[PDB]
Design an enzyme around this catalytic site. Structure first.
Site, PDB file in Angstrom:
ATOM      1  N   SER A 204      51.799  19.135  54.727  1.00  0.00           N
ATOM      2  CA  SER A 204      50.396  19.442  54.867  1.00  0.00           C
ATOM      3  C   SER A 204      49.727  19.394  53.514  1.00  0.00           C
ATOM      4  CB  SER A 204      50.289  20.871  55.426  1.00  0.00           C
ATOM      5  OG  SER A 204      49.035  21.497  55.218  1.00  0.00           O
TER       6      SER A 204
ATOM      7  N   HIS B  85      58.672  20.001  63.451  1.00  0.00           N
ATOM      8  CA  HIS B  85      58.478  21.374  63.955  1.00  0.00           C
ATOM      9  C   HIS B  85      58.129  22.411  62.873  1.00  0.00           C
ATOM     10  CE1 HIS B  85      62.646  21.596  62.650  1.00  0.00           C
ATOM     11  NE2 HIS B  85      62.428  22.895  62.479  1.00  0.00           N
ATOM     12  N   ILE B  86      57.421  23.468  63.279  1.00  0.00           N
ATOM     13  CA  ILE B  86      57.086  24.630  62.470  1.00  0.00           C
ATOM     14  C   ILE B  86      57.083  25.806  63.438  1.00  0.00           C
ATOM     15  CG2 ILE B  86      55.795  23.598  60.505  1.00  0.00           C
ATOM     16  CD1 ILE B  86      53.205  24.817  62.259  1.00  0.00           C
TER      17      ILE B  86
ATOM     18  N   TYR C 176      53.296  30.070  55.374  1.00  0.00           N
ATOM     19  CA  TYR C 176      53.272  28.672  55.816  1.00  0.00           C
ATOM     20  C   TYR C 176      53.234  27.707  54.594  1.00  0.00           C
ATOM     21  CZ  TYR C 176      51.269  24.338  57.781  1.00  0.00           C
ATOM     22  OH  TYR C 176      50.980  23.036  58.118  1.00  0.00           O
ATOM     23  N   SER C 177      52.324  27.980  53.670  1.00  0.00           N
ATOM     24  CA  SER C 177      52.123  27.222  52.445  1.00  0.00           C
ATOM     25  C   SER C 177      53.384  27.246  51.578  1.00  0.00           C
ATOM     26  CB  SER C 177      50.903  27.753  51.699  1.00  0.00           C
ATOM     27  OG  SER C 177      50.655  27.012  50.519  1.00  0.00           O
TER      28      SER C 177
ATOM     29  N   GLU D 188      45.857  20.729  69.923  1.00  0.00           N
ATOM     30  CA  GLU D 188      45.438  21.942  70.638  1.00  0.00           C
ATOM     31  C   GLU D 188      45.650  23.210  69.803  1.00  0.00           C
ATOM     32  OE1 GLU D 188      46.369  20.696  75.255  1.00  0.00           O
ATOM     33  OE2 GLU D 188      46.596  22.823  74.709  1.00  0.00           O
ATOM     34  N   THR D 189      46.822  23.315  69.149  1.00  0.00           N
ATOM     35  CA  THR D 189      47.223  24.448  68.318  1.00  0.00           C
ATOM     36  C   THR D 189      46.284  24.676  67.118  1.00  0.00           C
ATOM     37  OG1 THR D 189      49.481  24.278  69.120  1.00  0.00           O
ATOM     38  CG2 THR D 189      49.179  25.352  66.963  1.00  0.00           C
TER      39      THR D 189
END
Ligand SMILES: NC(=O)c1ccc[n+]([C@@H]2O[C@H](COP(=O)([O-])OP(=O)(O)OC[C@H]3O[C@@H](n4cnc5c(N)ncnc54)[C@H](OP(=O)(O)O)[C@@H]3O)[C@@H](O)[C@H]2O)c1
Ligand SMILES: NC(=O)c1ccc[n+]([C@@H]2O[C@H](COP(=O)([O-])OP(=O)(O)OC[C@H]3O[C@@H](n4cnc5c(N)ncnc54)[C@H](OP(=O)(O)O)[C@@H]3O)[C@@H](O)[C@H]2O)c1
Ligand SMILES: O=C(C[C@]1(c2ccc(-c3ccc(F)cc3)cc2)[C@H]2C[C@H]3C[C@@H]1C[C@@H](C2)[C@@H]3O)N1CC(O)C1
Ligand SMILES: O=C(C[C@]1(c2ccc(-c3ccc(F)cc3)cc2)[C@H]2C[C@H]3C[C@@H]1C[C@@H](C2)[C@@H]3O)N1CC(O)C1
Lengths: 276, 259
Positions: free
Chosen positions: B145, B95-96, B158-159, B196-197
């Site tokens: 990621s 999750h995020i 996010y990074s 999709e996101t």
């Protein structure tokens, strides 16, 4: 003063440092009551710059300011408080910028008190490390950016080898230093495309002979410590020269291997993957 | 070399499993005959996954809905799941918090929420799961990621949270090695996937050759089962060649002689 003009930065200025580059510059140094922070304060005082220092200890900061003026600091002031308080972090910058009449360099150096221990269940230390060592830095940057944009200034982020490679006994600390790299390297790329002339220097340091580090490693880690004076200067040098990253360690092998050319290559390959 | 029999009867947690890569992982595990406990905020979407999982031949399938913003929910979810399955073999942290591509200006709330959801809950979930994983000599799977290895603009918060995952989990991996804790840690470094996101977030900003979510989900499970330190999954041949950092492993080995 008014009959004076020109530029210190010309041909060779991206390569060779001169203490004259910091002459009359408005600098903030966080966690500057001791260690590298205090050593940076002292070097800036000598170069003929304006300084506003911070840490929690009012007494220790007074001693730094006194000594700073003695070394030839264009001006020296302190504002004491904790970087756990995001409100203090935000107003410190405005209050500090008011004192100097602007800002040319923001040196983010403070960290929360950390010791070497295996990770078991200390979520409070994980959260406090993220808040103090990382989040406060973001809050300070947001507060300083309007002034740095006006001056085409610099952000200097003090990180560690533990913010580039993995080390045991420092999980929360290492997480907060890696986060600094993710955040500040991302906004550096945003500033490049938005043509924001604020440079970002990430300083990757090895063991430094500060009182705190020497006490913390005692009987646990047996490693060569580099001098805090030279470290402080190398940090200021990279900031003034607007280098993306500064590496400072005792080991010759570290300096040779620390750089990640493949990262620089991968980061270049996506210039061609960005719309307006 | 991987074999689907490795997951047969294994007790697995999959976070952020109501959609995308998470849901694809829940589906692959069910096919392999694992016991699964899935989580996300959407009760309705989780029900569909559980039903579709029991449909694919899962030993057992359960869901517990809630937000990973709540550290109390994160802690209790693991114990609750551990009670349901009678233990734990694999913890998949995927999750995020909802993120879009934008320049950073002053959104400290999104910086803090990204650190809390994408990073801190992962630590909370790990602390809660470790006694069970030690008993089973289990595995921790961390979905990261390329933005958790290299810098990208428009994803600062996010990074930061994905780089933090690397710093934290790579440090405890070294601690588990010297403490002889037989719990493996897999950091999965993913490129653009066809969820999709992600397809919606890149629309009109960036275009590439979106890697399939099905294969991605499997490669994540494969690395976990094989107990690999890092898994790399991207469409670009150039990425696979440049993503690895041999000099980091060399430097990490040099400081092992110092304690
Ligand atoms: N020393 C090394 O070996 C080494 C190696 C790699 C990287 N670094 C980096 O270098 C930087 C400086 O390290 P150092 O060894 O010079 O540190 P240090 O001597 O321990 O000094 C820490 C400074 O931060 C302040 N500080 C502590 N808690 C704070 C809080 N809650 N709010 C605000 N300020 C706080 C301290 O004063 P108060 O306690 O009075 O607040 C002091 O001024 C850090 O970013 C560190 O990660 C150092
Ligand atoms: N897709 C890519 O291109 C790509 C690339 C690199 C890395 N990754 C990594 O892959 C992972 C999955 O990506 P994805 O594309 O499959 O994502 P996705 O489809 O957007 O799924 C996100 C999942 O997290 C849940 N979630 C969101 N907020 C939550 C919260 N506060 N508490 C608990 N659960 C929450 C979502 O459902 P609810 O809203 O119902 O809770 C959903 O289950 C992420 O870690 C992402 O960083 C993906
Ligand atoms: O960042 C620091 C300095 C420091 C640290 C961190 C990791 C180890 C280390 C070394 C070999 C190992 F194998 C494992 C851990 C030892 C010391 C000091 C102790 C502690 C954590 C951190 C910041 C300060 C000062 C804090 O007081 N360093 C020194 C490394 O080159 C990067
Ligand atoms: O991690 C992700 C996926 C993702 C993302 C992040 C950065 C960019 C990107 C691309 C070119 C640039 F130049 C700058 C940024 C585009 C998308 C998607 C959108 C958003 C952030 C993040 C996680 C999900 C899915 C979230 O919904 N990726 C794809 C990259 O290979 C690493």
């Amino acid at each position: 003063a008014s009959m004076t003009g020109g530029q210190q930065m010309g041909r060779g200025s991206n390569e060779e440092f001169r203490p004259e580059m910091l002459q009359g510059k408005k600098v903030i140094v966080t966690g500057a009551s001791k260690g590298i922070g205090r050593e940076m304060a002292y070097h800036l005082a000598k170069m003929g710059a304006h300084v506003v220092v911070t840490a929690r200890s009012k007494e220790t900061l007074q001693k730094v300011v006194s000594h700073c003026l003695e070394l030839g600091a264009a001006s020296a002031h302190y504002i004491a408080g904790t970087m756990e308080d995001m409100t203090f972090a935000e107003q410190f910058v405005a209050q500090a910028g008011k004192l100097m009449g602007g800002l040319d360099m923001l040196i983010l150096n403070h960290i929360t008190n950390t010791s070497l221990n295996l990770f078991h269940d200390d979520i409070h230390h994980v959260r406090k490390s993220m808040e103090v060592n990382f989040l406060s830095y973001v809050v300070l940057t947001v507060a300083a950016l309007p002034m740095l944009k006006q001056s085409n200034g610099s952000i200097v982020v003090v990180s560690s080898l533990a913010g580039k490679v993995a080390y045991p006994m420092v999980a929360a600390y290492s997480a907060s230093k890696f986060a600094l790299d993710g955040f500040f390297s991302s906004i550096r790329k945003e500033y490049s495309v938005s043509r924001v002339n604020v440079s970002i220097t990430l300083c990757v340091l090895g063991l430094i002979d500060t009182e705190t580090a020497m006490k913390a490693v005692s009987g646990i880690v047996h490693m060569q410590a580099a001098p805090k004076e030279e470290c402080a200067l190398e940090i200021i040098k990279g900031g003034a020269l607007r280098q993306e990253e500064v590496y400072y360690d005792s080991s010759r092998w570290t300096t040779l291997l620390i750089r990640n050319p493949c990262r620089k290559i991968l980061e270049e390959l996506y210039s061609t993957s960005y719309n307006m």
